[PDB]
Design a protein around this ligand. Sequence first.
Ligand SMILES: *C(=O)N1CC=C1/C=C/C(=O)NC(=O)/C=C/C(C)=C/C=C/[C@@H](O)CC
Lengths: 179, 181, 178, 182, 181, 181, 181, 177, 182, 179, 180
Amino acid sequence: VPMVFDIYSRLLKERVIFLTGQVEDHMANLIVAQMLFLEAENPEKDIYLYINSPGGVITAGMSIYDTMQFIKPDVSTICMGQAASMGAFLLTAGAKGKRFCLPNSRVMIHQPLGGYQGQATDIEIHAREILKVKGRMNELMALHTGQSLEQIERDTERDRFLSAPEAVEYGLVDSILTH
Amino acid sequence: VPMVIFDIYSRLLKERVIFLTGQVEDHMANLIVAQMLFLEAENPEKDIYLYINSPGGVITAGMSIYDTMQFIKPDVSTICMGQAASMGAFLLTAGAKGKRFCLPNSRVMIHQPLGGYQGQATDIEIHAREILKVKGRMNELMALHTGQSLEQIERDTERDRFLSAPEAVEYGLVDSILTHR
Amino acid sequence: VPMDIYSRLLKERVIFLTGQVEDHMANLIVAQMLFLEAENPEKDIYLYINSPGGVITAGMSIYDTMQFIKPDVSTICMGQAASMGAFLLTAGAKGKRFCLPNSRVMIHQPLGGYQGQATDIEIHAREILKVKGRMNELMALHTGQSLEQIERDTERDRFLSAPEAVEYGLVDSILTHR
Amino acid sequence: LVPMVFDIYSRLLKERVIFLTGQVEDHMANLIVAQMLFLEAENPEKDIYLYINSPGGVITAGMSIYDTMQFIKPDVSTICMGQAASMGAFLLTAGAKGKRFCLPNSRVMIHQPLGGYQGQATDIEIHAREILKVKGRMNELMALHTGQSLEQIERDTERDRFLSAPEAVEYGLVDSILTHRN
Amino acid sequence: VPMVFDIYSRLLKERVIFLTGQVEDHMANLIVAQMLFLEAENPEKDIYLYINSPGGVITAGMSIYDTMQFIKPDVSTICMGQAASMGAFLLTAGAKGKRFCLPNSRVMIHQPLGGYQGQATDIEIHAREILKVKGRMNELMALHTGQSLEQIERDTERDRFLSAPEAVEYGLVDSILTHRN
Amino acid sequence: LVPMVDIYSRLLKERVIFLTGQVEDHMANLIVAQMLFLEAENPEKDIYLYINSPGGVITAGMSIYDTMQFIKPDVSTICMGQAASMGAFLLTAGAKGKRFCLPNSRVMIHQPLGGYQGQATDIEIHAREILKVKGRMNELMALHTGQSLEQIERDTERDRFLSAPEAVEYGLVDSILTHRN
Amino acid sequence: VPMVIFDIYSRLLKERVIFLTGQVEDHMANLIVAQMLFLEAENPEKDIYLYINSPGGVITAGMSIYDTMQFIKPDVSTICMGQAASMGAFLLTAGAKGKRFCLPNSRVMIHQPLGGYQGQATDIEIHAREILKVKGRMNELMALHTGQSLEQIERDTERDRFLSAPEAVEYGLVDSILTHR
Amino acid sequence: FDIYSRLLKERVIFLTGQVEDHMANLIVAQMLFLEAENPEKDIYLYINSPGGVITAGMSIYDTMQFIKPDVSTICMGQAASMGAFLLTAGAKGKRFCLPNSRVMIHQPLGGYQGQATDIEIHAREILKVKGRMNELMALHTGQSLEQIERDTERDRFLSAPEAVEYGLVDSILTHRN
Amino acid sequence: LVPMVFDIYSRLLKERVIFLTGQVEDHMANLIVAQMLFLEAENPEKDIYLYINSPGGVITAGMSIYDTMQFIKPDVSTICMGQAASMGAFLLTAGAKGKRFCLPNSRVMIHQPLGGYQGQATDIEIHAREILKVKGRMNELMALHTGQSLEQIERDTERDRFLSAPEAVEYGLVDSILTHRN
Amino acid sequence: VPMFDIYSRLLKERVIFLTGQVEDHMANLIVAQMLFLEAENPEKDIYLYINSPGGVITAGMSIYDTMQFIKPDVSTICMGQAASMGAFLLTAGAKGKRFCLPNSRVMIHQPLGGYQGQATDIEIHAREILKVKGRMNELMALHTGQSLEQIERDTERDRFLSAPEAVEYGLVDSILTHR
Amino acid sequence: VPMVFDIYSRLLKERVIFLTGQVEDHMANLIVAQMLFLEAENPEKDIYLYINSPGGVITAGMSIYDTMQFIKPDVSTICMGQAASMGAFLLTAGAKGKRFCLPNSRVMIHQPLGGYQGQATDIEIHAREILKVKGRMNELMALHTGQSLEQIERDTERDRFLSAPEAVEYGLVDSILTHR
Ligand SMILES: *C(=O)N1CC=C1/C=C/C(=O)NC(=O)/C=C/C(C)=C/C=C/[C@@H](O)CC
């Protein structure tokens, strides 16, 4: 926190938000607030969301996704370091043509995780829900990547790593940032 | 905690935006009550905006928010982002009619009250009676805000029941879905 | 264990109920009663009781065994007999229930607790009251008190001295000396 | 985090509003006393508003607030939101007669004092004797503010008892229910 | 503990086995060993199984059930204290005409419980298995009690207590042992 | 506590061994000792191995497997309750025609589990060994069940449950033990 | 507890000096990226100075700094004080050609990547293949910045190796040694 | 008597689990006992172990070589680090693996905290142990010291057939008689 | 509790006073390095004053300070108050010649390096060899700044060695003792 | 910490508080406050309130050497208690300006310590703590006016002194009752 | 554990005692009891003490030393695995000419260890005591090994390991057992 009002605040005045670490309700709500704030200051200028995350909660990540799609400004996504699970999902949800990976970035995709304890009836309720989510997520990933739903299904059954150039060909990102 | 040129949650509080985040409990809820009472004093005519992303929490804490929402003059518009479960779903539906919203991929889970007690059998009967009264009042308010019958709310809350953003408008929990600005 | 010593007294038909009452120690008490019956179904059994309470179900497995087996089960309270230990004390064969001069007895209503959904909460609270009702019935049966009196005296902890227990009806007499 | 405007609670304090939230204990209660003394000094005649959402707490801590409400000239209007149990229910009814309020779905719980001690039978008698006096004064003060008899307060507090907002009006703990701002 | 040698061993010479506490692989394996041992001593004389259990693992309980049904001697079941989850299953799995409750016994029945963590694919695998178990347990309940399959399901969805006389009327046991002879 | 008459020892004179709980080096070494002991007393009489296990270590389980195959007497395997991971493997390793399930037994098969921390060079070494182990386990499974190696690989990639009748049709077991003689 | 004047690290940021201290991880690395992006905006032409005193850390986090150094226009001069091990040593040599430095008693340590995973053998193969790709790419970039052959980087990093300040010059990790100003 | 003891009267010893001072002494005592009963008949040491302390394991090794009777070693399940060492120390021609037994070998492990002077002392000793340990391996397997040095620098697994080729074991047991 | 004026340590930093306190480690040492670079920027002529009260710490962390002390233009004066052990005692003697000081009842303690490692024998040899190289360079630097022979520093650091304030001026660790100001 | 700070507002009055056990970090700030006050005016007295149950020897001696080195006289006031190192610094105040409050308590005892290791190392550290013990007794005798042989006999075991007992023994000059 | 009856007792009927693991008051008292018992059964036949120990308390170890020297039977010592600190002391305390190492046994020697918390006065008392111990242990080591007191001092100041052959030349052991 290089005080002056730290440094992350200086770069917020330039419309740059940092998504770092595990994604969860509180850090995600903080990202939503920043995106809503930047929209209010200027709904026409793009927003820049850097992503370096190993994954996190689905609900928390989707609160960011819906905010990215809701606000008028385009949200450009930049992956530095790694973007796994929901971090990869939000990376691909950026505005078309403005999704980027750095040359030595790293991306991992897989299916949702979950768990429940209780009576068998409750187990059925919660099991059928996480599958509904899996279908919702594969559909959305297929939409943003251009792959078919069936392809997303086969590649997310188990963890799958993609390099920065592999991430462009598969369709999660548009190009690689250089210079 | 990013700051402008003075904190971000405070800056959005000037635009009349309140965030209900995380587990619901007496202190975070009392903070929501304070923001609602504050916004009312500065301008009773204008709407209030309550974002809800919560997996549930205490009933007593949530009802301090509910009664404050209905008591203050300004309408409180409720916006569900991420998820709104248990009391988070209840407060979502308590927003002003026509101003309840879900985001396209939001989620809302509903169930009956939870509780527990240890002690003498006489004391157990007292608390078992009260928790059943709580369950009754919540279903009544749930039926009132959704337009559903009391018997349907009873049927659907006995066990956990997840609901999608469009399913929440059908069931009556919310009025519409926010899709792009 | 001086050894075995509890077994040497088992051949004299002496069973010891000691400590908290729970499924495992109670099952051992039931096994000894079944064993002593097999040895001689006509002779009395002697159950010393020194317990601060315990589980009802575990205690009722002992109660049901005493009533089922042919031999009369004489009960002797030494030290103290509280909650479920007091229940089994008074369940002894009429006329063969005893307290020692400085024994103590405590009675109260059942304890319990549960977590879960309101529907499930309602089921278990309705069951513990059924249990509370039955014990009060059995308490009234063995002591001779009215069901209304057992209710009033068990709503809160009540202590009874050895002579107070003979007047209340929990026990028949006091063992002083041989 | 607490939003800014100074704190959020600090501006509603300028509006003569104090918030009693959570367990009541020496420190949070002492803070409530400090706010009350501050508002009295600013203007002794204007009312003070005390919102109450508490599941109970220490008796001694609660009585430092009670005596402060009774001591200062300004009337202390009490508002129950969420719940007001054990010590929270006591301070609710100690508000200025005519200015005690519940919200429509508030819940109030009353019960007798609780305690505990380890030590000498001699010391046990001393502490068991004090807690019974506290129970006595607590019941008397409750009877005073509610209009109920001392004999009635004793019976209803022997075991936990829940009261709805309208039930709290009829029993006398609170004067009316606030539903919509006039 | 009382080495008469060992009291539970002396009672085994009389064909009496004790199922006590939580049912699990190890305590259940001992019961199977006792049943197989008693069968070898005399395949004709009955075996007596006392049951005081608050529940346990199904798989462990089913190893006892299949052994009870497989061996030639009839296995009479006696409920003392309480018989919940698997304890109620093994109680009613005793020989038709030889299942007993004590006057103040208590029986509780409910559906299976479980839990799993992992990938959604794995969750679907395990969640489908526990539902298969639920189906077979309810089927076995209908067989041994005489109740319909539809009835066992409706009564086991949530915890259901049965008194000793109630367990006789329902078909869980046949009679109540009160005072020998 | 163990009912004496020991009970597992009195059944050891009947050539009955019990494999119970998680399989590991110490309990498995004891199973080898009982098999070697029974072989010495009579290399022509069959051995009876009851299996009720949720899985365990591979090496420990394979010490039992190689012992079962080495001794002269046939080792008949009986699954009661459940037979998961390595427990299911040893079930199918029983002597041809002498593998049994009880009517309500449950069999579970899956691929090997493992994990390692260290330098990348060491990671490759252990990742390669578990892949060799995985390959050998599928080969042995295919040999004893009659299924193809391709089929075993499909069926073990993720947890798969088989009922007693599903285990006979698959080749894990030869028949089901229902009643005696 | 940094000493104020701004703060000490900020007053030193106005001179284009960034500090990489302690273990490398997502958060401490992200702040370094923010500082580099900020300094680029203040002046894309003036060099940036990165002091490095680290015993290692996460690769992914370290590569976010590497990619940022290569992405921004200004040259990033790296200074090693104390020690620079694992990813700290990688970023040390990723500095601008001609502007990488060690202090007289600095120490550099290089070794291959470390890692670990638990799960199914199939998942094990996936993650083991990935850490080896990372090992390959890291070795490739190291050979690039040092001028050494890939075989040499592979052969010297299989095990921990320490380099003194002068040794780091003749190896290619650093360009020269800073002694007196 | 007991099952492990009942098999001891037939000269069968079980080395199971981690190797450590106390379990190893039981192995040493049984070998001395057996020797006293009959110094000619062979002794049978089954091995299923993931490793353990060197000194404790070497107390077994020196006892096997010291006692008159031949000590036959049989690996069931797995025989790693020192367990692999003792497997190979069995009497020549009477060392055995089961068809699906596994074997893992690696160099010694250790650690110490203290002054630099003391660190040098203990680091010099573990390298002396490593030398003697590799020497003994070359003697019993027939491999060259250079080969043992290359193959133990990092963990190395050997299957039952690989263990007969490498020289750790003499043959593979499949069926009795 | 961080006295204010402004802060107190910030007020003395403007006077070119740096405090080395407690255990030496990467972060507290990095903070000391930053202050030295800052003071150099303000005026590369004036001297810097480093008070030392430490029981030791990591060598790499201490050497980041040492190399900074020698690299920057201004002289770094060292003052030992309380104690200066292992890494504290070296930084003390590494101060600018003629400006190294002990207070009258200060204490200096020196010894050889401590360390440890777990792993394969091959890895043990690498780390055992390296720590012996560090010990060598430390004795080399210690001998250079004190004026003692390398063999003497070796014989005196093999085991713990305590030195009083007057013992430290003769041994060569410090130049003189400050008893009273001016 | 009411109000800008209260300890900072009394620092303008040249009042320093030594509270709690003495250790390297809390002692460093007292040194910093003394050095700061010296710079502000080397001629006005400094006021050191002492309420401490003891602490580390080295940490306490950094304060002692600072008290004696700076030009201004350091007046010491004992309130509550002054035990081990707290008692030593109390008596180290400028002669004639050491004070006790009427019901303050002073406790003195010999140094405490401990070590694990080789016998040779045991001799070194036991030899050193006895040197520390030797100095501390010398300085106490120097500041109190007592004989060295007396300080030794009286510090071998815990010795409590009342405020009036402290004036006869020499630790302090007078007692501040009222004013 | 293998009830032959029992295995360690079966070998106690061959006058064989096992000193295994850490040396401490209770395991040492058990060793003392066996030595006193064997003396009672036959004061003439040698006793055989196998030693595999990484060290332990000095006083506990010296209770064994004084018993070996007090009883009439000679105590032959066998080092298997390792014999460190007090284990090495008792190894060499065996009857001269009857001390043995196995081919790959390991002996480690060093000076005493200790520690104390308290007042400086008490610190000196316990420090003077451990040094008196240190001086007394070195004396006996010199007596049993044939080395000089100065050599024992120099060589125990720091950990020093000795192989089986190194132990015969230093005087710790008489010969190496290899076959029978
Ligand atoms: C000198 O210190 N160095 C050269 C090699 C070293 C190693 C130092 C080392 O391990 N230092 C520590 O971690 C020391 C920690 C201590 C002594 C902490 C003391 C804390 C106080 O609270 C004790 C009263």
